[PDB]
PDB file of C-alpha atoms and ligand atoms in Angstrom:
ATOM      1  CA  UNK A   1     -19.641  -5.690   3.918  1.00 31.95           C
ATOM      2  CA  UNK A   2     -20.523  -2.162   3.272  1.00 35.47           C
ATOM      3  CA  UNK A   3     -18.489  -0.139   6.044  1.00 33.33           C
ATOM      4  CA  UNK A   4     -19.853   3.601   6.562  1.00 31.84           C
ATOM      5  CA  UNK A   5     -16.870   5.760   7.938  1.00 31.37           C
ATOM      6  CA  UNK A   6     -18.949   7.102  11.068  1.00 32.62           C
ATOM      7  CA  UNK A   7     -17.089   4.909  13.402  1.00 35.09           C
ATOM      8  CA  UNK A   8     -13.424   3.404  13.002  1.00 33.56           C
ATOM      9  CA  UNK A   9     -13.209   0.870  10.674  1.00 35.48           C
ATOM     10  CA  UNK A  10     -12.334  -2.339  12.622  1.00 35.51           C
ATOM     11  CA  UNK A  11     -12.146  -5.794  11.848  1.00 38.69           C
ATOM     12  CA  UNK A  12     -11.033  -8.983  13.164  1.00 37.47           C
ATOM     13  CA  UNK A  13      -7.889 -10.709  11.133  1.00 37.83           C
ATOM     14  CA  UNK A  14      -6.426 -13.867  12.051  1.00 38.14           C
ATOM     15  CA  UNK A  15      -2.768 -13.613  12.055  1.00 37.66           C
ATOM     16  CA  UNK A  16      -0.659 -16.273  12.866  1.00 39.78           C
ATOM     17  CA  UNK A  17      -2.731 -18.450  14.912  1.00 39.18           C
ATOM     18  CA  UNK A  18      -4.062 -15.190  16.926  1.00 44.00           C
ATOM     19  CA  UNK A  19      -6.803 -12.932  16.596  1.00 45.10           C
ATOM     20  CA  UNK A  20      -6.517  -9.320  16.905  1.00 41.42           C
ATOM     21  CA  UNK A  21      -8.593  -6.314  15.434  1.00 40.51           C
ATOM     22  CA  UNK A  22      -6.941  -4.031  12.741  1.00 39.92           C
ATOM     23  CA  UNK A  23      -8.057  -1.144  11.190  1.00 37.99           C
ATOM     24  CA  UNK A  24      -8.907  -0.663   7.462  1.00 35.47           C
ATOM     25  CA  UNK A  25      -6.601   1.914   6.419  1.00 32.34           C
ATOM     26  CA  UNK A  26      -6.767   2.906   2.826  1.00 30.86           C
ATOM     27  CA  UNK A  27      -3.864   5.318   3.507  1.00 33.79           C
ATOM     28  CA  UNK A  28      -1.227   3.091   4.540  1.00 35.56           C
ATOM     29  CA  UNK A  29       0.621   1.355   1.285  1.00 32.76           C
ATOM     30  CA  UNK A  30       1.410  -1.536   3.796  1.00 29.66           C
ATOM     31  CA  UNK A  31       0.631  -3.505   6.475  1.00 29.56           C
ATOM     32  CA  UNK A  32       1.766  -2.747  10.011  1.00 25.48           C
ATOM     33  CA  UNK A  33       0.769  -4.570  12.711  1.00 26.48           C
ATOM     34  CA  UNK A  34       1.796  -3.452  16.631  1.00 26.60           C
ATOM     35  CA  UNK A  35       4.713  -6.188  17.891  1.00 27.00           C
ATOM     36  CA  UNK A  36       4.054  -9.823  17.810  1.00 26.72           C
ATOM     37  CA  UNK A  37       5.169 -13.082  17.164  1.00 26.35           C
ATOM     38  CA  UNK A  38       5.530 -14.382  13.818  1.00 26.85           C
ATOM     39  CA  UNK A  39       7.495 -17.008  12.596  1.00 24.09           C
ATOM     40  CA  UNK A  40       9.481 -16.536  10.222  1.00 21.40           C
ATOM     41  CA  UNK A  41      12.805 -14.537   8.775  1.00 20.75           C
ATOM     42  CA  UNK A  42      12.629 -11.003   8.460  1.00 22.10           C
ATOM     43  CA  UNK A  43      14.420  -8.115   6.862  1.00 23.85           C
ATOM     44  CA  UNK A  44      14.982  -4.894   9.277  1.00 18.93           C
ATOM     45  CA  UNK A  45      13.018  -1.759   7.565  1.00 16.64           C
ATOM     46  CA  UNK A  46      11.188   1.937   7.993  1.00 16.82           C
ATOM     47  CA  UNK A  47       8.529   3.392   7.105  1.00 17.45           C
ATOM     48  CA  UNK A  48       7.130   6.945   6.952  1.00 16.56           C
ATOM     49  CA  UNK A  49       4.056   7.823   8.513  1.00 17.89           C
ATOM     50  CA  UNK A  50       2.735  11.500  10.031  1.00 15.26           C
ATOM     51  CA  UNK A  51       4.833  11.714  13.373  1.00 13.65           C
ATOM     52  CA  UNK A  52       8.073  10.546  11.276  1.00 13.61           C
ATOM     53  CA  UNK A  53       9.597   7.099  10.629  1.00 13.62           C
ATOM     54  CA  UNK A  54       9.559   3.880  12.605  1.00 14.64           C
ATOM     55  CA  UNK A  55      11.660   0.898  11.927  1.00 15.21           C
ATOM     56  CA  UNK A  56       9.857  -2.248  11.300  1.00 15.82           C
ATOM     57  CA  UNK A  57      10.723  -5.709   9.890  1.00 16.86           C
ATOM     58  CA  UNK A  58       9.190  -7.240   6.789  1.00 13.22           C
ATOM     59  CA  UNK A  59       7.563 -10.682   7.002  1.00  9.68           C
ATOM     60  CA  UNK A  60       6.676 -11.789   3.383  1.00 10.93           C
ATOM     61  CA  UNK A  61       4.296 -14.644   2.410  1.00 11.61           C
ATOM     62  CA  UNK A  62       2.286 -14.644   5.557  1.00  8.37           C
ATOM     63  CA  UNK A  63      -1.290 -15.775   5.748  1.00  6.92           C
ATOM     64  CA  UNK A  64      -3.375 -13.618   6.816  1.00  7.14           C
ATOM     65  CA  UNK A  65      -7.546 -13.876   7.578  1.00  6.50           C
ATOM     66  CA  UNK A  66      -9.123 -11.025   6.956  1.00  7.01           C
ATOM     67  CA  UNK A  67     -12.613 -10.616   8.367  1.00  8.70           C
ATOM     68  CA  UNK A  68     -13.053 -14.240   7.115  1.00  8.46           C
ATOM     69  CA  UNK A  69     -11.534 -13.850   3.667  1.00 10.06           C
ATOM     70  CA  UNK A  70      -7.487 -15.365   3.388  1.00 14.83           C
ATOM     71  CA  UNK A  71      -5.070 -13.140   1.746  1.00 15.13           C
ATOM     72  CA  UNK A  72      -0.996 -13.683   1.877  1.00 15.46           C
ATOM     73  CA  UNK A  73       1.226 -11.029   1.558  1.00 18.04           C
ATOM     74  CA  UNK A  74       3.963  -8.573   3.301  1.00 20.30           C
ATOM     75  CA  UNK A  75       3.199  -7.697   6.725  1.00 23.31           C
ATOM     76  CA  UNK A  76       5.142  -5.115   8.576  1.00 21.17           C
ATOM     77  CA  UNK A  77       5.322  -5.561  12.580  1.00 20.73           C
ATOM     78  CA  UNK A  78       6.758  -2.295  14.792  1.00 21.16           C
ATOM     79  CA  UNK A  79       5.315  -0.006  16.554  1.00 20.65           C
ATOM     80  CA  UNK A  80       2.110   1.822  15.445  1.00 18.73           C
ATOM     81  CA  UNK A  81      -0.369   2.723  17.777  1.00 19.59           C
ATOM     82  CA  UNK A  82      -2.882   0.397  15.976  1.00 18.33           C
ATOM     83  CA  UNK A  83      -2.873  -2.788  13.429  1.00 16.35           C
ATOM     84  CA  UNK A  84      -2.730  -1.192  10.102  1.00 14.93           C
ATOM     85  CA  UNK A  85      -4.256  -3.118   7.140  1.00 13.23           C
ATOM     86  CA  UNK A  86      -3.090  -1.258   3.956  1.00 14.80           C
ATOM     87  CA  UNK A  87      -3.567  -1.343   0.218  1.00 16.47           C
ATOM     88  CA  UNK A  88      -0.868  -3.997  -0.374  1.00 17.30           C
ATOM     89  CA  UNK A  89      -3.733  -6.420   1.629  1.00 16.71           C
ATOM     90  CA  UNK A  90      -7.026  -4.646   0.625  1.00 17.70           C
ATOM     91  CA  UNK A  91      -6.700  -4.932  -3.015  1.00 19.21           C
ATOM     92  CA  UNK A  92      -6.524  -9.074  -2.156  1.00 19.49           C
ATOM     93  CA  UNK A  93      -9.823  -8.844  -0.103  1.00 20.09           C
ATOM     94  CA  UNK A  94     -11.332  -6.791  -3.117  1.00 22.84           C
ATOM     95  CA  UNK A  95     -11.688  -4.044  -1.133  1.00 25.96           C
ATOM     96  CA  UNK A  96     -12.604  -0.521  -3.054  1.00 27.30           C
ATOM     97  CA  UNK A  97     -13.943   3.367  -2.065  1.00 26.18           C
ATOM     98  CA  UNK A  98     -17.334   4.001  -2.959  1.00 22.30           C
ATOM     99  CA  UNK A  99     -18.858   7.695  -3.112  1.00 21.00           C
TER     100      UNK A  99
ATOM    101  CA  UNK B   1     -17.434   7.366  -7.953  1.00 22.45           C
ATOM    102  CA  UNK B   2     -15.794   4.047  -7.176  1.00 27.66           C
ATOM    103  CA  UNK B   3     -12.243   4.001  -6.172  1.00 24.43           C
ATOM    104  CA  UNK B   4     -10.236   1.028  -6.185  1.00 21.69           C
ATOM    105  CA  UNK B   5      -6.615   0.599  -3.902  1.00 22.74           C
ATOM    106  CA  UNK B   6      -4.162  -0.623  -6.784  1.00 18.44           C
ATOM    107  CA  UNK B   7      -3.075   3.346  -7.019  1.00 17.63           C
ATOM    108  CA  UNK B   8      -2.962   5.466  -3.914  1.00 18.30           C
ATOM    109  CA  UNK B   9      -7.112   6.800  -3.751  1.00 16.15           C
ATOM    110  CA  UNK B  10      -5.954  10.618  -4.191  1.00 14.66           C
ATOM    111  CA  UNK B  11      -8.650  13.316  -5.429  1.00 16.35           C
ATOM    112  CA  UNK B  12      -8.188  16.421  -6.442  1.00 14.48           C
ATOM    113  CA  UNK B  13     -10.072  19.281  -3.493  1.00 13.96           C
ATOM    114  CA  UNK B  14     -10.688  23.074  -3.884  1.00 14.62           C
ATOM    115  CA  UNK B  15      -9.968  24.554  -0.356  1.00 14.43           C
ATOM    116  CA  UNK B  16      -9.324  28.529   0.020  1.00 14.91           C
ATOM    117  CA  UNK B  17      -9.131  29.661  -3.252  1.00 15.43           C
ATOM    118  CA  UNK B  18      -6.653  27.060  -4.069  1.00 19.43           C
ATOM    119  CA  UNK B  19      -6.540  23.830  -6.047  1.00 21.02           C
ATOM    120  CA  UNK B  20      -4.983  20.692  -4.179  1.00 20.38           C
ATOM    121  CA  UNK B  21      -4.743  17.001  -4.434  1.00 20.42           C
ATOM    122  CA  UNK B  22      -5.156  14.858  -1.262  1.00 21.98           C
ATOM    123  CA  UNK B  23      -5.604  11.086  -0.003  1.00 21.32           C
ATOM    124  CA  UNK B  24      -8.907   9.278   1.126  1.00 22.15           C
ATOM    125  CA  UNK B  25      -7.261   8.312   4.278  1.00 25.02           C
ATOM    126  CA  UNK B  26     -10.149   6.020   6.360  1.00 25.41           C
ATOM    127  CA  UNK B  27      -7.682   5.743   8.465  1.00 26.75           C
ATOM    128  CA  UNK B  28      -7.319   9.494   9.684  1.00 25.10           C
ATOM    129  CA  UNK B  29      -9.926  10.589  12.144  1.00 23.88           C
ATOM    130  CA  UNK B  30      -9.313  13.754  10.962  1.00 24.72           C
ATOM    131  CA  UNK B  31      -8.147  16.054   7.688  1.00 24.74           C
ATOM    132  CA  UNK B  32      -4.578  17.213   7.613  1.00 23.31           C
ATOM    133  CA  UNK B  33      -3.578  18.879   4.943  1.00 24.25           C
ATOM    134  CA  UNK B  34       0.165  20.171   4.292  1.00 22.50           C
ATOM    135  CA  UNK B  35       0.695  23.815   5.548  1.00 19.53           C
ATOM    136  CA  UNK B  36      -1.002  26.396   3.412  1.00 17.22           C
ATOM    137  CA  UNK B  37      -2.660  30.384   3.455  1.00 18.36           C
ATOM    138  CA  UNK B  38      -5.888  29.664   5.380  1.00 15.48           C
ATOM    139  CA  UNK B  39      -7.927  33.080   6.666  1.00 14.43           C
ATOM    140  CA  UNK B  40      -9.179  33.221  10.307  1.00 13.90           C
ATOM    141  CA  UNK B  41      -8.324  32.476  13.652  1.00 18.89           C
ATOM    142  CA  UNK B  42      -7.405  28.649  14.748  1.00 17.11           C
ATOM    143  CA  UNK B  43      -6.021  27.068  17.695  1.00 17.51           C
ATOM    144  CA  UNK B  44      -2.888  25.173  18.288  1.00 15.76           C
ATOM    145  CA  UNK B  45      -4.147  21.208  18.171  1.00 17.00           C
ATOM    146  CA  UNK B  46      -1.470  18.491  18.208  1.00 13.88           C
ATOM    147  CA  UNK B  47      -2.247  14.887  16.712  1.00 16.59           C
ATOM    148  CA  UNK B  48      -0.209  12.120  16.287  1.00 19.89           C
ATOM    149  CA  UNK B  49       0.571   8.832  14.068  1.00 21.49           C
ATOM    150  CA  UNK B  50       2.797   6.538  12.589  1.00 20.48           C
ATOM    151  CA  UNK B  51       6.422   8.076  14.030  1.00 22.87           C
ATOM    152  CA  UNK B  52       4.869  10.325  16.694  1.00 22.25           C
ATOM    153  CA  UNK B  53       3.540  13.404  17.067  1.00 23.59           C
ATOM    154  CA  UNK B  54       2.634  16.820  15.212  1.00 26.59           C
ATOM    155  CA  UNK B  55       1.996  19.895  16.414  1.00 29.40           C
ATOM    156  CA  UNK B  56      -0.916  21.518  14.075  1.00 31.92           C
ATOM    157  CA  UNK B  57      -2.803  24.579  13.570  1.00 35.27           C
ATOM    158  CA  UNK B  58      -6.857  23.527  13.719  1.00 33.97           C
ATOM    159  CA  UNK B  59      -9.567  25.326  11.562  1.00 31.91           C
ATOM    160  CA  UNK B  60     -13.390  24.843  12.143  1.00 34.90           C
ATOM    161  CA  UNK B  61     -15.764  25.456   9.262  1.00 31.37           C
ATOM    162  CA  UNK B  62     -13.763  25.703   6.552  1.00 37.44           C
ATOM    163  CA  UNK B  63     -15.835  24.755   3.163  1.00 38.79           C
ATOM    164  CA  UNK B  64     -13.475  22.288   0.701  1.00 37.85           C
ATOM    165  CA  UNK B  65     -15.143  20.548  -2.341  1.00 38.67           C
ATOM    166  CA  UNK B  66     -13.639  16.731  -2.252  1.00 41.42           C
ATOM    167  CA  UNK B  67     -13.625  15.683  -5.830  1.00 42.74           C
ATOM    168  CA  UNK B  68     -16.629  18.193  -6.637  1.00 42.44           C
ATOM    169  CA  UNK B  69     -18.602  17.697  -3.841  1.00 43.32           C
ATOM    170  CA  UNK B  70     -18.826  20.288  -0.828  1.00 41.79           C
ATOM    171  CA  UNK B  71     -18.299  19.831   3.052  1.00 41.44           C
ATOM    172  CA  UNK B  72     -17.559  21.977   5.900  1.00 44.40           C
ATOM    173  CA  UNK B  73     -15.783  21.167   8.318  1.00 41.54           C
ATOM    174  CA  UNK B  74     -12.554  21.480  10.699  1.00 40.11           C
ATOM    175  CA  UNK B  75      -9.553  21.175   8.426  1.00 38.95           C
ATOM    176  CA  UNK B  76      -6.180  20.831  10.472  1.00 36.00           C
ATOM    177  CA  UNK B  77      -3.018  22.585   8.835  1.00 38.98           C
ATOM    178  CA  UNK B  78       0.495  21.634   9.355  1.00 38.52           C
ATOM    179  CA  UNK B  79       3.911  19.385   8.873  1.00 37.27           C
ATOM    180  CA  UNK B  80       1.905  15.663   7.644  1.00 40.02           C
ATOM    181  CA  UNK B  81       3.919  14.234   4.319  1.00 40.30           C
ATOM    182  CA  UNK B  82       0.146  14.459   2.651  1.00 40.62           C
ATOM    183  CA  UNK B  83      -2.565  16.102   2.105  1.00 42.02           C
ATOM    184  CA  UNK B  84      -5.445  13.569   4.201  1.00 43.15           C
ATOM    185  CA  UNK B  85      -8.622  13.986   3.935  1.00 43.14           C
ATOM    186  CA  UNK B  86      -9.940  11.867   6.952  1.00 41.88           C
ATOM    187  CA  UNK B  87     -13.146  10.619   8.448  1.00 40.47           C
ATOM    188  CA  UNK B  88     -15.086  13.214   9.681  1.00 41.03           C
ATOM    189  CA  UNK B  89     -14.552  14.775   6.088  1.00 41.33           C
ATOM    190  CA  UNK B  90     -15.219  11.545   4.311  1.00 41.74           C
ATOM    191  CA  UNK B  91     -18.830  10.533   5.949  1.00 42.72           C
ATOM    192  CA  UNK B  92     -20.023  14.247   4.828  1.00 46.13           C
ATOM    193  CA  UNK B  93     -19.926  13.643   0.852  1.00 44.97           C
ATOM    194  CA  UNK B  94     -21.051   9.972   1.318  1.00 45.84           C
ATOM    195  CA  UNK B  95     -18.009   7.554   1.145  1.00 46.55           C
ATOM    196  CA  UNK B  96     -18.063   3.574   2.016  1.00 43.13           C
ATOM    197  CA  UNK B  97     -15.956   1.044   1.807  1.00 41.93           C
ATOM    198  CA  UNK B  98     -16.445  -1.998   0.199  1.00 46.59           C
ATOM    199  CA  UNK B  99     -15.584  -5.867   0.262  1.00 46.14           C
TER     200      UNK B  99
HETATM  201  C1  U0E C 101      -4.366  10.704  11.164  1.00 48.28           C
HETATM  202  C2  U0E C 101      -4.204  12.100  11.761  1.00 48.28           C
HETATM  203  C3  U0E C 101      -5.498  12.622  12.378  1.00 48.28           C
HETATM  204  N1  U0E C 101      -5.454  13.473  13.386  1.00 48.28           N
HETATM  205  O1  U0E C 101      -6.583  12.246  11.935  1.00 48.28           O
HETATM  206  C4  U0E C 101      -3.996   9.592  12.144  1.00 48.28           C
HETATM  207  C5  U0E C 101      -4.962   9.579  13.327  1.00 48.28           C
HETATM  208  O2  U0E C 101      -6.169   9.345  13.161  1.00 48.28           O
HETATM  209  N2  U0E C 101      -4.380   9.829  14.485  1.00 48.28           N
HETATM  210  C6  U0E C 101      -5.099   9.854  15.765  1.00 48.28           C
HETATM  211  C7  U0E C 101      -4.427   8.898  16.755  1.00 48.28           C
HETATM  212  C8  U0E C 101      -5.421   8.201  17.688  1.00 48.28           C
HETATM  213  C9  U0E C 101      -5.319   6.673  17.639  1.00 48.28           C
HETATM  214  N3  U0E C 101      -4.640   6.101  18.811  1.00 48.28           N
HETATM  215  C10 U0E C 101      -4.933   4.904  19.342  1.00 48.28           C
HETATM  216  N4  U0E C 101      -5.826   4.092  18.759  1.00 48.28           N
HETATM  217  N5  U0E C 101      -4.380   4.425  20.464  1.00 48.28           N
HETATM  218  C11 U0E C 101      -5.078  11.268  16.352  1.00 48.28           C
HETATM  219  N6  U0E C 101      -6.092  11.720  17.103  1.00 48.28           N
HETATM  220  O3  U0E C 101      -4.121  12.030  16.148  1.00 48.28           O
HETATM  221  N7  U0E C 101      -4.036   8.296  11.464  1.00 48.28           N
HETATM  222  C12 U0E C 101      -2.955   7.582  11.262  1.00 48.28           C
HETATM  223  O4  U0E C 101      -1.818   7.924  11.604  1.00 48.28           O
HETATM  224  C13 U0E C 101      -3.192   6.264  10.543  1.00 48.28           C
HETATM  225  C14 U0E C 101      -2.204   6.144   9.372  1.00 48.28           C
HETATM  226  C15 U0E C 101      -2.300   7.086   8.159  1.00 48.28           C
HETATM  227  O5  U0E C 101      -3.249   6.507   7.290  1.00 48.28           O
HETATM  228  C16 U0E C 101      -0.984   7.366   7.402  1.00 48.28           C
HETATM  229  N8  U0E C 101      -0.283   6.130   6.998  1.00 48.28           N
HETATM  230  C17 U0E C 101       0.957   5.815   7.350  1.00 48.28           C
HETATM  231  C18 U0E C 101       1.452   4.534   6.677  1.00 48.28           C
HETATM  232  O6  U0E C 101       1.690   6.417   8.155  1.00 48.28           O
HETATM  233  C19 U0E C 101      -1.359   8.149   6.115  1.00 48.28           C
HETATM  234  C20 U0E C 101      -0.079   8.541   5.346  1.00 48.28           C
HETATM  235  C21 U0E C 101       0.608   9.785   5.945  1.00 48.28           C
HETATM  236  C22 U0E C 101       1.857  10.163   5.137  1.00 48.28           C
HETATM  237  C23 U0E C 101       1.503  10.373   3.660  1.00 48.28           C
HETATM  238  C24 U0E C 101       0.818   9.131   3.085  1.00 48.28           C
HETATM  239  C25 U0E C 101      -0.441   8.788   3.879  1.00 48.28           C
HETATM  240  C26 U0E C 101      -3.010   5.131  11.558  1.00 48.28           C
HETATM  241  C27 U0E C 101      -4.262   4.885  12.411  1.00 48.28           C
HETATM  242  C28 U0E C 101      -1.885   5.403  12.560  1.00 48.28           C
END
């Protein structure tokens, strides 16, 4: 899918047996996705982002469905305003900037 | 060009007189680039993210080249860890992204 940046960027991941809406974010390193329940150990963590630094908690080697395409990887769950897909998860998807 | 998300997507702008280097950020709305010497009058905007919220200065038709091409548009100018250039920046010199 060719996504054109007049709207947000949106799509529809499936994330431990739920479906939720993330955005595409090309300027987030991670993945951060608003609290939820995952399964799972974690490790306590914080990230930087404009307002200053949240705490989060690292989930590694989670499956994640990603507009229909599967990719595993680190997800970060805290609280951001929205579901964050970052570059950690769109270089699995194959997903690249075009100008 | 074609930009792919192994390496933070960062291109080098001319804004003011001044040579900078900033983020494709799809997911920033707007551009926020760290506080510089802009001329003219702007008013006091406030935005938020990832760790809350900042308290910018806002700029309307300011002309910036993004990796050579040109775009006017507001430019926002205060404490952000970055340089962002965001979507309404990023749909002017033609920008998708792909999957
Ligand atoms: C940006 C800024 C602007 N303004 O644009 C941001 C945004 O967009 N914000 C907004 C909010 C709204 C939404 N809400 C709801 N949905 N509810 C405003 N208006 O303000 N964006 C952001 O933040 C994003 C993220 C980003 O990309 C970042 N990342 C992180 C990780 O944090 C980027 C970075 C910064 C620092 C340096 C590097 C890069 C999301 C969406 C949150």
């Amino acid at each position: 899918p060719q996504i054109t940046l007049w709207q947000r960027p949106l799509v529809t991941i499936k994330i431990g047996g739920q479906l939720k809406e993330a955005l595409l974010d090309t300027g987030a390193d991670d993945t951060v996705l608003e609290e939820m329940s995952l399964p799972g150990r974690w490790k306590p963590k914080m990230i930087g982002g404009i307002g200053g630094f949240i705490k989060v908690r690292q989930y590694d080697q989670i499956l994640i469905e990603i507009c229909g395409h599967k990719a595993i990887g680190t997800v970060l769950v805290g609280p951001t305003p929205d579901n964050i897909i970052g570059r950690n998860l769109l270089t699995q998807i194959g997903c690249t900037l075009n100008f």
